Amino acid sequence: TYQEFTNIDQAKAWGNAQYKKYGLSKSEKEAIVSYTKSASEINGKLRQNKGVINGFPSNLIKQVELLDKSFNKMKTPENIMLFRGDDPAYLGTEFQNTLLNSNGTINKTAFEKAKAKFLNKDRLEYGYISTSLMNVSQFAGRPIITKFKVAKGSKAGYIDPISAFAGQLNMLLPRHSTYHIDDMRLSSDGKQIIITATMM
Numbered sequence: 545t546y547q548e549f550t551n552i553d554q555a556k557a558w559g560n561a562q563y564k565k566y567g568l569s570k571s572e573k574e575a576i577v578s579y580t581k582s583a584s585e586i587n588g589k590l591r592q593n594k595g596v597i598n599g600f601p602s603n604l605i606k607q608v609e610l611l612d613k614s615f616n617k618m619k620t621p622e623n624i625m626l627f628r629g630d631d632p633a634y635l636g637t638e639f640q641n642t643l644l645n646s647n648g649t650i651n652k653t654a655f656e657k658a659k660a661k662f663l664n665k666d667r668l669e670y671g672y673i674s675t676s677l678m679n680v681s682q683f684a685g686r687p688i689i690t691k692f693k694v695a696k697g698s699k700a701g702y703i704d705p706i707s708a709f710a711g712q713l714n715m716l717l718p719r720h721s722t723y724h725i726d727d728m729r730l731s732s733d734g735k736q737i738i739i740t741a742t743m744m
Contacts, residue, residue: 546623546693555677555713559702566617566701573706575610576716579672580708587671595670595720608719611672615718618701626675626692626700626715629683635661644687649734658737659728666744668722677702677713689731690739692723698743717743 549555568576579586586608589600597605632643635658642654676682679689694700694717704714727740 546625548625549677552678552713559677559704559713559715562618562621562702563705568614568617568706572610572614575607576614576703576706577708578607579611579716580674580703580706580714583672583674590670590672590719593670612718615699615701618699618716620694620696620698620700623696624677624694624700626677626694626717627679628673628675628690628692629686630688630690631686632688634688650687650730650737652730655728655730655737662725663728664725666722666724668720670720672719673717673721675715675717677715680712682709682712687735688737688739690741692717693740693742695743
């Protein structure tokens with residue numbers, strides 16, 4: 545049983561309540577703000593290097609170590625569900641230019657091939673995972689929506705107050721996370737794939 549927030553006021557109150565007691569240091573807050581501005585670049589470098597940071601520039605090694613350390617203070621007090629939007633390349637190079645029909649809907653054949661590739665499989669992410677407490681506007685245009693089931697006691701932080709995209713109920717999960725794909729379905733209007741996954 546995982547808490548899915550369905551009310552914006554409820555989600556914001558819960559998020560603010562967690563943030564109030566983290567006690568993040570000045571340098572930790574600075575590292576997080578900076579991450580939200582350059583997330584795709586940082587996560588891309590982590591993926592290219594399979595999580596090995598020893599050869600990174602000195603500034604970036606420092607930042608990654610601060611982000612990692614930040615999670616010693618940020619844990620969820622209950623089973624929760626988190627949301628994220630992704631573009632077609634998330635499924636592989638063979639889906640980048642095939643997933644979408646010209647009219648914006650998901651191509652049905654490509655959907656079936658993506659389901660065969662990923663359903664009931666584990667996936668390892670070398671980057672951090674930026675998410676939200678709800679299905680928010682910052683990724684309404686994205687063709688893939690993932691709902692992550694995160695267990696009580698797991699590392700997870702409400703970072704909305706120290707995010708460049710404040711107002712979007714922003715949450716962060718740690719790098720090198722693994723999750724199991726439980727379900728993949730087409731939305732009722734055929735414009736998105738909805739994925740359900742359980743975090744390990």
